[PDB]
């Protein structure tokens, strides 16, 4: 019997206790493992079992054979990449969503699911303080997705088809997209996906003078240069909080540029967007009225676990018309027919914790990053490569207190020895000539003590090699 | 505190008990609701709460305000669309995956996650008895996705880029895709997504003579007709178990056709693919050696809840080369960087139940559909419009025992009155001139009694209008 209810409630507690013990381990568990390729592949049978096995033997096999070979994103010692903010409400909302197992591709196939997605989308829109034109009650509207690439693909398709409907159906080889050299690779990936040619995905270089922002004058000059070449610009992507540096592009200026040439402006909210529920960061959303579309990942700061990605349009019919084949049918809003009930999990998280708790959780992470930055700045052995705007601190070894020419390779070795120690996991990028470490505060379990321990470990490892 | 562990275990039991009571309701709950647009939208607050609320008040609000406005896919009275096979192991594996919250886009960011995806992919490949060329140990390999449209998009991109690398970079406007008129709309959707022009997505009509299969001779003639027009065929999609009728396309013949013109052959396993773990249905996979790619939805019959979609390639480098920007990095295998740990849930389900239980669950659903077909065939008031191959029975009112010309509209009214009664939910499609009802056995909760009740209700409703 596959749906035995007493067995269901029996094994549910087993799995929940497994998860709680995993969580309590993470203060000790080495974050990133050191294992050999094929360790698990050779350790597991070649074919599937004919018969079944109990739940607790499965869970034991999990905790001994798969857990050690995991990178523990939830560890309070994990400060690399970008957080997978997890909470009790997010986990239990995942469980409830999967228990309902309602797949609502149209309003008729689950009215409540679509209406609850509507209200959650509008809730978040006013939490971020967008104009009415992005709300369902203001003309536009939004949708939940799984990743930012689904939303980016949807906007790219809508923009491409709007352009082609204006200039001609067989003109796809002339469409030109613009983004900065800091834009997430997902933009180039999606542009290549929707048939844009490789030469026409222009990454405009950014300069340290402009804080690596995408300058609108270079955008305008590139646009008219390619227009004099007989090609059709159609898409521009600005970013709030880039991956490597956390750059915020000048949204309003690029909005005026995109309006002047009637280009589709999309805003990758990405990492910084979630933080914009706070009044301090809301200014990073000015010019949003000139924006065609905005996407943002809630699983990067809003404690929803994985996964959930909001996407808001001022003219949603521009998207529905691109993918279709009053009452909302989300079949025409994204890639596939099959959708999950993510709205119930976002609703769960929000009503369980409150805008208050969410605001202050973001503020606590940002404050911890402020303190980490203040600690780096007090050490002449180190250097901020770019001022922090959120919970992202980018730093490296000082060149004055390292041998000539090897400050970057010694920064890389510092990061490697820290990660190999197992006591923490930091990210790091090679921006041409320089290498720098990213420390991202956001692992939910992380408190002040963990940031203090991380800074002390970075210092102790630096003294171990520097001079 | 967002990660309070004692509060986590306290509220987990609340949510689990909520789910178990929901499940036990489904024998009584009217499957499809009758509600007005805006019922939930007006019933919920305009903005998000500043403060939080308890878990049980949330769950009460769920069971009173959202559950009644749901279409209960998990009800044993639900036989429309295609099942969302759910089990205890699938639900608890969803919970465990979300609890681990490990996001592994590369082997380095979670070796165990990638290796376990590898072994699960290979397990399923040998469960379906594919050639070695689709296994990681045979040259090719596979990947887990969320939907069939992600897999279809990946294969379409790989095929398009292979073609363009052969014929020219600026030739996208000449690429031609072929599918039948029974193919799922996701194929046309993805073809439009990757920049194929609308005229070049050719739906070749199928004839009732060929059981609506895609005849390979018409495929060949269309190919050489478009080749004499100076266009580049590049993609052909065959289907095992179509949505409306459950058609199986002649895989091997289309394989030889696609080999002759070096076209990319993709197989939408879709609905029938999952059933192919059974030896009786494995014959529906012959010619699979000539196939470039195969996708199949495990959440349609393999009891994994939602969602999980296997995709196997004979040459995975053809996909990696299309989306990239030994040890496997699934970042280059699909649409986005962010991936979930679906492998752990599939592993959970398989090792908990067994290939034995899975085979026999498929066989029990197929047997129930056999019995439903036998019941329809014994009633002169009804008629099978297409012979059943899986758990899909397509039937309608007999034209001999209805007034001239209105057998189809009376079949539609029959379906409408049954669905409106709330005692069951059946699907129905208008194939040009005829209308017929689809009954799909697969709601997990469904036993023999429910099929008997459904047949009696269909008969009682038919006598209520027929003569």
Q: Which helices and strands appear, and what pairs or packs with what?
A:
The structure is a homodimer of 467-residue chains.
Chain A: H1 5-25, H2 55-65, E1 78-79, H3 88-100, H4 111-127, E2 141-145, H5 148-167, E3 175-180, H6 185-193, E4 201-204, H7 216-228, E5 232-239, H8 251-260, E6 264-268, H9 272-275, H10 279-282, E7 293-297, E8 309-313, H11 317-323, H12 342-377, E9 382-386, E10 392-397, H13 407-421, E11 425-431, E12 434-440, H14 448-463
Parallel strand pairs in A: 1-11, 3-4, 3-5, 5-6, 6-7
Antiparallel strand pairs in A: 2-8, 7-8, 9-10, 10-12, 11-12
Description:
- Chains A, B: Belongs to the group II decarboxylase family.
- Chains A, B: Catalyzes the production of 4-hydroxyphenylacetaldehyde (HPAA) directly from L-tyrosine, tyramine not being formed as an intermediate.
- Chains A, B: Its EC number is 4.1.1.108.
- Chains A, B: Keywords: Decarboxylase, Lyase, Pyridoxal phosphate.
- Chain A has 14 helices and twelve strands.
- By secondary structure, chain A is an alpha/beta fold.
- The first copy, chain A, has a domain at 103-340: Aspartate Aminotransferase, domain 2, CATH 3.40.640.10.
- In chain A, helix 1 (5-25) runs parallel beside helix 2 (55-65).
- The interface between A and B is large, with 136 and 136 residues.
